[PDB]
Design a protein around this ligand. Structure first.
Ligand SMILES: *[C@@H]1O[C@H](CO)[C@@H](O[C@@H]2O[C@H](CO)[C@@H](O[C@@H]3O[C@H](CO[C@H]4O[C@H](CO)[C@@H](O)[C@H](O[C@H]5O[C@H](CO)[C@@H](O)[C@H](O)[C@@H]5O[C@H]5O[C@H](CO)[C@@H](O)[C@H](O)[C@@H]5O)[C@@H]4O)[C@@H](O)[C@H](O[C@H]4O[C@H](CO)[C@@H](O)[C@H](O)[C@@H]4O[C@H]4O[C@H](CO)[C@@H](O)[C@H](O)[C@@H]4O)[C@@H]3O)[C@H](O)[C@H]2NC(C)=O)[C@H](O)[C@H]1NC(C)=O
Ligand SMILES: Cc1nnn(Cc2cc(C(F)(F)F)ccc2CCC(=O)N2CCN(Cc3ccc(S(N)(=O)=O)cc3F)CC2)n1
Ligand SMILES: [Ca+2]
Ligand SMILES: [Ca+2]
Ligand SMILES: [Cl-]
Ligand SMILES: [K+]
Ligand code: NA
Ligand SMILES: [Zn+2]
Length: 802
């Protein structure tokens, strides 16, 4: 019940929302059908349009007008945004030469530059270039301020998950808005775009910026706007709030536009009908900037122009139907479209088996335009598993396609030519970022970055301490003139042991066998003390950020941090120069595993466990193929370099080690590789403790990794070799799932040169993703600034073209 007989006189767009059955005048009241009777009349005036004209100049104030051209309007803060242009001979902001804003130039009484976030739904990254002739305000923001060529959204590349990620710095799995549509089985409740259940706060985790601001004493405008409030009214309201008295005036604001997303769905991302929406957005920006300039706020406010996601070409004819794969198609519920999520229609149905559904959806048609996954097998870079609202079965859908349950669902609902929601590395899903103002840099281009990083920066812009989030705070310090956040390296928690020779051969009963001078004896000892370690450990040893027991093991060709708990290296580091040679494994050594005399039998793997485990085999972290000499090659067969590997996974690993590492070294002028295992049994994106491990090599305490990582580092300036690099680094990494089959790659019966590299690209990762998963901290000893290293650790090599 709403007693809509209260009134909105003097309460229009009130910042504190009032509690039913008192009626509402806030910018969401329309959406809850709860505005006071007089809201439209008082708060949504439109009389006489949105622009002063010569004749209106000087007029007698008439409170019915949408905006005013009287003399008193400035002090009231309710002039039309073009008043001074039309009535005082001033220029439009867009026509002014840009000038560096070295310091905030704010009116007295401002305690900090305000921040205005101008968010645009579906504003694809390439619009900045391709629409540049029709968006002159936006292009001035872009060229005069700080911009990225594009900004990476989060998966799924839908509106609500992305707006709320922008607001909180959290991955959807952590904030809870995992799609535009959702079932929570604990609530036994559904969430949709349409309707009331999305207004319930229990859907919305973390702490978004407006609440972070409020709790720390910074006042916030209301970010949300009901769809019927026209854009011109949203701008005027923001400008009005900015005219408020110091003790009431907010410091942070958001504008939101439904365009160009709304048109993009109907006409496609580059439909000729898309030029007008782009013009209109630009004109709204112009109105804001002119408005700010009238209030002398145009060199005082920080403005963020940001999108939630892009837009791709998609039509009804490009639909895969699950009815063409499953006989049982009515025993499932599909969340459909540009992704799929599948659960049972009924939990009472005990014959529903996700495994058989997955198999019926796997590599069934030669050009199949979706790929099914258990959520935990999705690429780790998507961070899309650790929420009860994300279904166990997921369909990653090819760009340009839709998935539906049955054909009736498509023609009983062609309408659309644009959609989004695909994989967040797809170019068409990329969006924009521009920062303009005293706190942003001047005429600066920054590299692409992910939208999870912005919450921290908006916090920095407002002098706030951010709630705990998934950004890496400092990785965007290079966007800012000042208010940088100066982080320190996390402290190492466990220090390594440096074991020497302590055990005799005959103390090992491992079931392992191997067919195996004073100048070259002193030599191999000094390789076991770490004489070549400057070569193989280029960026310092990783710091272990939890409590555990481990050993640093030196060798001629590689260095490792060996875990006595997990019985294998946490990391293995080695450098392969451009000049290096690949050799094969000689025959006498094919099944050779050698005891490591620095590590007790009791902290070693054994070969007999692998012999008895019919499913599990083993591989090596430092590849024997890249040994520097026949004598060094013996070190690669130490038991302490061994890790558990399914035969299906060895195909991948072997090809990566034998072929690809040499290739990258050749193309990048040497590489440093750090590889190791990852244990994420509960798919939370975080390092598992021992008691979380669900699988061991049969009959042993040898835990099985869920994934294998490698971090491949070289000199950004590739004319310098990786091991003699003076400047910025360049990195690519991956987190390969450790799977007993290659069902994920439909062409895996072919030669590895046709599918392995493609799999690795799919499983590209940020170093930061690996850190979370391992509890290690990399690049501790470089000659680069820590902020620069943080940027590098957040880098994702995506493998899309320009
Ligand atoms: C991205 O960044 C985020 C934020 O930093 C990271 O997520 C954090 O991860 C932390 C570590 O896993 C986690 O810390 C836990 O907090 C528990 C209390 O949490 C509540 O309070 C916080 C703070 O106010 C609040 O934000 C939480 O909100 C979550 O849950 C509600 C659902 O009710 C949602 O509305 C909301 O969206 C959010 O959901 C997400 O998080 C939860 C987990 O917290 C997930 O399950 C969801 O899927 C979703 O992803 C909470 O209301 C605290 O209880 C935990 O403590 C247990 O484990 C510790 C280990 O130290 C142990 O010492 C304790 O004994 C305790 O165990 C007891 O309970 C167990 C479970 O019932 C039981 O098994 C034991 O036997 C014990 O009895 C833990 O300290 C933190 O909450 C989240 N924060 C957020 C916002 O998600 C995320 O890791 C980052 N991602 C990456 C890849 O880096
Ligand atoms: C989603 C979402 N997450 N955060 N925002 C806020 C946000 C964040 C950012 C910024 F970029 F800065 F983060 C920029 C702009 C915005 C505003 C987006 C917006 O006006 N709309 C129109 C209204 N719909 C419906 C809607 C209505 C009500 C609610 S409530 N609070 O009552 O439960 C939830 C709703 F979804 C959402 C989009 N939107
Ligand atoms: Ca959107
Ligand atoms: Ca985990
Ligand atoms: Cl969805
Ligand atoms: K075996
Ligand atoms: Na296959
Ligand atoms: Zn959309």
């Amino acid at each position: 019940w709403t007693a809509t007989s209260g009134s909105c006189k003097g309460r229009c767009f009130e910042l504190q929302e009032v509690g039913p059955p008192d009626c509402r005048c806030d910018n969401l009241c329309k959406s809850y059908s709860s505005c006071c009777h007089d809201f439209d009349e008082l708060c949504l005036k439109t009389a006489r349009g949105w622009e002063c004209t010569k004749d209106r100049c000087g007029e007698v104030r008439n409170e019915e007008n949408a905006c005013h051209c009287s003399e008193d309007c400035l002090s009231r803060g309710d002039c039309c945004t073009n008043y001074q242009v039309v009535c005082k001979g001033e220029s439009h902001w867009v026509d002014d030469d840009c000038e560096e804003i070295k310091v905030p130039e704010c009116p007295a009484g401002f305690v900090r530059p305000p921040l205005i976030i101008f968010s645009v739904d579906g504003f694809r990254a390439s619009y900045m270039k391709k629409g540049s002739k029709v968006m002159p305000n936006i292009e001035k923001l872009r060229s005069c301020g700080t911009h990225a060529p594009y900004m990476r959204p989060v998966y799924p590349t839908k509106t609500f998950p992305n707006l709320y990620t922008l607001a909180t710095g959290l991955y959807p799995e952590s904030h809870g808005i995992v799609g535009n549509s959702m079932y929570d089985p604990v609530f036994d409740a559904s969430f949709h775009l349409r309707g009331r259940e999305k207004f319930n706060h229990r859907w919305w985790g973390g702490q978004p910026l407006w609440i972070t601001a409020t709790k720390q004493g910074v006042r916030a405008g209301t970010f949300f706007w009901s769809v019927s409030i026209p854009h011109e009214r949203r701008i005027l309201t923001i400008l009005q709030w900015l005219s408020l008295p110091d003790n009431e005036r907010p410091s942070v604001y958001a504008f939101y536009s439904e365009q160009p997303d709304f048109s993009g769905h109907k006409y496609g991302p580059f439909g000729p009908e898309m030029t007008n929406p782009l013009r209109e957005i630009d004109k709204t920006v112009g109105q804001l900037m002119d408005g700010l300039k009238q209030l002398r706020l145009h060199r005082c406010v920080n403005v963020i122009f940001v999108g939630d996601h892009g837009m791709e070409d998609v039509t009804c004819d490009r639909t895969e139907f699950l009815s063409n794969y499953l006989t049982n198609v009515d025993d499932i519920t599909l969340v459909p479209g540009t992704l799929g999520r599948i659960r049972a229609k009924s939990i009472n149905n005990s014959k529903y088996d996700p495994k058989t559904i997955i198999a019926a959806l796997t590599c069934k048609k030669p050009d199949q335009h979706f790929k099914p996954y258990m959520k935990q097998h999705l690429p780790k870079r998507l961070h899309y598993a650790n929420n009860r609202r994300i279904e166990d079965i997921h369909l990653l859908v090819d760009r340009r396609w839709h998935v539906a349950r049955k054909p009736l669902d498509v023609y009983k609902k062609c309408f659309f030519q644009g959609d989004h929601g695909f994989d967040n590395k797809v170019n068409s899903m990329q969006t924009v970022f521009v920062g303009y103002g005293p706190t942003f840099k001047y005429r600066t281009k920054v590299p692409p970055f992910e939208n999870i990083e912005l919450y921290n920066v908006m916090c920095d812009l407002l002098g706030l301490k951010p709630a705990p989030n998934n950004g890496t705070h400092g990785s965007l310090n290079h966007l800012l003139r000042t208010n940088t956040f100066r982080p320190t390296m996390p402290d190492e928690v466990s220090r390594p042991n440096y074991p020497g020779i302590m055990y005799l051969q005959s103390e090992f009963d491992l079931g392992c066998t191997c067919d195996d001078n004073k100048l070259e004896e002193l030599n191999k000892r000094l390789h076991t003390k770490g004489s070549t370690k400057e070569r193989h450990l280029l960026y310092g040893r990783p710091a272990v950020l939890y409590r555990t027991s481990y050993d640093i093991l030196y060798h001629t060709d590689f260095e490792s941090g060996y875990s006595e708990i997990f019985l294998m290296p946490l990391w293995t580091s080695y450098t392969i120069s451009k000049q290096a040679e690949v050799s094969s494994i000689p025959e006498h050594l094919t099944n050779c595993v050698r005891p490591d005399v620095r590590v007790s039998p009791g902290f070693s793997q054994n070969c007999l466990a692998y012999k008895n485990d019919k499913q599990m085999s083993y591989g090596f972290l430092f590849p024997p193929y890249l040994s520097s000499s026949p004598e060094a090659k013996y070190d690669a067969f130490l038991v302490t370099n061994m890790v558990p590997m399914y035969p299906a996974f060895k195909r991948v690993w072997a090809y990566f080690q034998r072929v690809l590492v040499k290739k990258y070294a050749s193309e990048r002028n040497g590489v440093n590789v750090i590889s190791g295992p990852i244990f994420d049994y509960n798919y939370d994106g975080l390092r598992d403790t021992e008691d979380e491990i669900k699988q061991y090599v049969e009959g042993s305490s040898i835990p099985v990794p869920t994934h294998y990582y490698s971090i491949i580092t070289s000199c950004l300036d590739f004319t310098q070799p990786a091991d003699k690099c003076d400047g910025p680094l360049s990195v690519s990494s991956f987190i390969l799932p450790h799977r007993p089959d290659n069902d994920e790659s439909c062409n895996s019966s072919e030669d590895e040169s046709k599918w392995v590299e493609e799999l690795m690209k799919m499983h590209t990762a940020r170093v930061r993703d690996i850190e979370h998963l391992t509890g290690l901290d990399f690049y501790r000893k470089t000659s680069r600034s820590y902020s620069e290293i943080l940027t590098l650790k957040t880098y994702l090599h995506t493998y899309e073209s320009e």
